From a paper:
Unphosphorylated STATs form an anti-parallel dimer/monomer equilibrium, and upon efficient recruitment to the cognate receptor–kinase complex, are phosphorylated on a specific tyrosine residue, which promotes parallel dimerization by conformational rearrangement. The activated STAT dimer translocates to the nucleus, initiating transcription of target genes and altering chromatin involved in loop formation in enhancer-promoter landscapes. The canonical domains of the STAT family are all present with the coiled-coil domain (CCD, S138-T331), DNA-binding domain (DBD, F332-V470), linker domain (H471-D591), and SH2 domain (Q592-P685). Archetypical STAT-type SH2 domains are comprised of an anti-parallel β-sheet created by three β-strands (conventionally labeled βB-βD) surrounded by three α-helices (αA, αB’, and αB), which are also observed in [name].
Notably, STAT5BN642H was identified and validated as a severe oncogenic driver mutation. To investigate whether STAT5BN642H perturbs the protein structure, we crystalized the mutant using the same domain boundaries as the  wild-type protein (A136-Q703). The crystal structure of STAT5BN642H was solved to 3.21 Å with a similar space group to the wild-type protein. The βD strand containing N642H was observed with excellent electron density and showed two distinct conformations. In one STAT5BN642H conformation, the βD strand associates securely with the βC strand forming additional H-bonding partners, not observed in the wild-type conformation, thereby fully completing the anti-parallel β-sheet. In this conformation, the H642 likely coordinates the phosphate, similar to that observed in other SH2 domains such as Src and phosphatidylinositol-4,5-bisphosphate 3-kinase (PI3K). The second conformation showed the N642-containing βD strand dissociated from the βC and βB strands, resulting in an incomplete β-sheet. This partially completed β-sheet places the SH2 domain in an open, potentially inactivated, state. Alternatively, it is also possible that this conformation is more capable of activating [name] either through facilitating interactions with the C-terminal region and dimer interface or providing greater access to the pY pocket to increase phospho-ligand association kinetics. Notably, the affinity of the phospho-peptide with the full-length STAT5BN642H (Kd = 15 ± 1 nM) was ~6–7-fold higher than wild-type (Kd = 102 ± 11 nM).
Author numbering: 138 to 184, 188 to 388, 392 to 426, 433 to 685
Write the structure that this text describes.
Amino acid sequence: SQKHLQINQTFEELRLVTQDTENELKKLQQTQEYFIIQYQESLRIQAPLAQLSPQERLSRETALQQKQVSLEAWLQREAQTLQQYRVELAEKHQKTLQLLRKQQTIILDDELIQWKRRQQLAGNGGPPEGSLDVLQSWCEKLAEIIWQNRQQIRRAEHLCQQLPIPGPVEEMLAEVNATITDIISALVTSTFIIEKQPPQVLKTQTKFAATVRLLVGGKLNVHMNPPQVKATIISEQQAKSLLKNENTYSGEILNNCCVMEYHQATGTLSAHFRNMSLKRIKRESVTEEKFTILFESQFSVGGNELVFQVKTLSLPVVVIVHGSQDNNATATVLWDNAFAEPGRVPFAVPDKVLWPQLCEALNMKFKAEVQSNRGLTKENLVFLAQKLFNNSSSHLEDYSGLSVSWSQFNRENLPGRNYTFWQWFDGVMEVLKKHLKPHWNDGAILGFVNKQQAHDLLINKPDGTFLLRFSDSEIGGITIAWKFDSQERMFWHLMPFTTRDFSIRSLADRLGDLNYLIYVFPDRPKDEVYSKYYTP
């Protein structure tokens, strides 16, 4: 709300200029209305009497001729100054439209794109996009202003019809009116946006919902006949070709389609699809290929033949065969939302991406999935960097460059056999989501440490001190590294704990069973950490 004031200041300026231009047009109408009555006086005086003496007739005729030439000189002057006023009106309307064009481009091409990008990022666990009531109010002011100016210009056109003065004013009005229709088309087509987009990575037969909105709908007389909006699922090639306006239905049948509703209190025109269900799908990989939900409608503005065909595209959606593949499919979505270009041709993502750029997305989605504000720290980030690029470095700035190809992210296996770097990271995400979210928030799980790295870090600690790291041995497991003096002369080796283990006994109970483990990493004792989570 710092440089939002810039927008509202420009809006007050626009309001003032349209108001004073309307006042100018009122004065011009009064001027013309008086001019035509004086011109009718000239018509009555035009061309002229009954029987009189030749002495009085000369006087009468010369007085009438005087009145006639005077009235002609008065009319030519009045017409001239009237035309001056008219061209001034056209000039002021032009100026207002130019600045309104700048403002509309500011809102539609920047702020709306910013909000849509907020939405895009929220799909990866980022901050929520927020409410469009600010953008809705802005678009209401835009529509109000431009429609009022259209009314003023058409009124000037009608006024020019009744008393035509040659000049260059008709071309000015024609040029300005075309600009008006162009602006209206841009506004109406650009403010048909998906408020809550439908949740990507969806299976067939499952009910999902999305909500689309018309930001300008409150006014502009679209609400008078709330149009029907139809949703249909189309492939990526279909979306690409449609944006180029081809013709082709690329993803079989969709269950629903609905009509818009207007909340007078909220003052919003929106379409709520609460019960859509995907029942069939046409169909490189069974899971990488992305689709999109297309919403389209058509509506009229007031009493005009002006009909707008509008369409909008959801951000890319992936269709899952069965839950087994779902864990992988989100990876695809993760890249798109993370790395979609601003003016991208539909669903085109870079294959390169630098490491810190991927780090920001991984960290964001991690804090989202584990439902905590702990998140990824620098040491964790170096751990995953050493995991991805087999490279001997323990400083983050050494990995400040480096490009993570999509393949090495999710297609090429690591030096192990884990389903690429993404599967291991999604595995730790899932194990902490379903089982160990509280222990992650509490700080008991260091996790992002290595066996030897956990070792030398843990040697000096007193006997009985443990720490839990995420196993590179198994995908979804965590292992324990412990401190005892005899240790190596003893046997004792434990298997990593996975979801299967955690389902029957749970982590706190497993640690309770092991009496020889008594301190969490630094000085924290076991009971202090796990007392509330032990099973009474």
